[PDB]
Amino acid sequence: MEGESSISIGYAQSRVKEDGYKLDKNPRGFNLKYRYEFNNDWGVIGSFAQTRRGFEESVLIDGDFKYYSVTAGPVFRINEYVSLYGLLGAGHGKAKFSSIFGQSESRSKTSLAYGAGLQFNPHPNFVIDASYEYSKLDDVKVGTWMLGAGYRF
Numbered sequence: 567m568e569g570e571s572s573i574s575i576g577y578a579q580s581r582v583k584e585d586g587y588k589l590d591k592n593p594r595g596f597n598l599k600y601r602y603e604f605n606n607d608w609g610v611i612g613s614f615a616q617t618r619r620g621f622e623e624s625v626l627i628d629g630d631f632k633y634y635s636v637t638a639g640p641v642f643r644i645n646e647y648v649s650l651y652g653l654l655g656a657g658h659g660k661a662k663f664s665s666i667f668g669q670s671e672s673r674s675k676t677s678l679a680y681g682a683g684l685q686f687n688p689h690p691n692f693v694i695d696a697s698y699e700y701s702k703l704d705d706v707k708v709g710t711w712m713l714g715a716g717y718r719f
């Protein structure tokens with residue numbers, strides 16, 4: 567009820583699109599969420615997420631794409647089993663390139679990130695968390711799904 571924290575860790579996967587094309591394969595990573603309930607009805611929740619996809623060519627070129635976000639928002643409990651939340655924060659996207667010819671360069675952008683999710687408590691001490699997040703970084707669109715689990719105490 568009042569003063570309950572929930573901590574969860576989860577898998578995260580992004581679909582990254584620009585101008586009708588999708589980056590292959592999808593960046594993947596993790597999501598950590600921390601929630602604190604002020605009372606039986608309202609609380610706050612914070613989220614960090616990161617997904618990555620690396621690429622290499624050998625016999626030599628390499629690059630990687632990384633997205634991470636920090637978001638937060640109110641979380642409302644419906645009953646003992648289910649709570650819903652919305653999130654707002656910042657997303658940062660980065661594409662980094664390097665070769666044996668000397669090139670080492672990146673492109674990056676920070677913009678708003680928007681999210682929404684829910685937490686399910688099959689028992690009062692457990693959490694299953696699922697959320698979606700979206701960020702537009704210039705003309706690159708990053709949509710991220712997250713599915714996690716953890717504990718409530």
Ligand SMILES: O=S(=O)(O)OC[C@H]1O[C@@](COS(=O)(=O)O)(O[C@H]2O[C@H](COS(=O)(=O)O)[C@@H](OS(=O)(=O)O)[C@H](OS(=O)(=O)O)[C@H]2OS(=O)(=O)O)[C@@H](OS(=O)(=O)O)[C@@H]1OS(=O)(=O)O
Nearest residue numbers: 630631632634658659660661662670671672673674675676
């Ligand atoms: O270039 S440095 O000698 O300052 O060392 C910085 C290392 O962090 C990286 C990580 O990026 S990654 O390889 O893509 O994972 O860059 C990150 O940190 C820098 C430095 O910022 S700081 O607060 O002065 O230290 C940011 O660069 S800048 O904004 O200062 O110009 C980066 O921001 S940006 O993405 O280029 O917009 C930041 O990247 S990120 O936000 O973590 O994605 C690497 O620096 S980098 O290759 O120049 O980007 C360094 O890590 S590494 O494993 O040595 O490559």
Ligand SMILES: CCCCCCCCOCCOCCOCCOCCO
Nearest residue numbers: 584588589593631632633659660674675
């Ligand atoms: C894992 C997310 C990678 C997001 C990189 C975004 C870079 C921010 O702005 C760059 C805009 O132009 C750079 C083009 O880089 C291509 C990245 O998108 C690939 C989708 O096909």
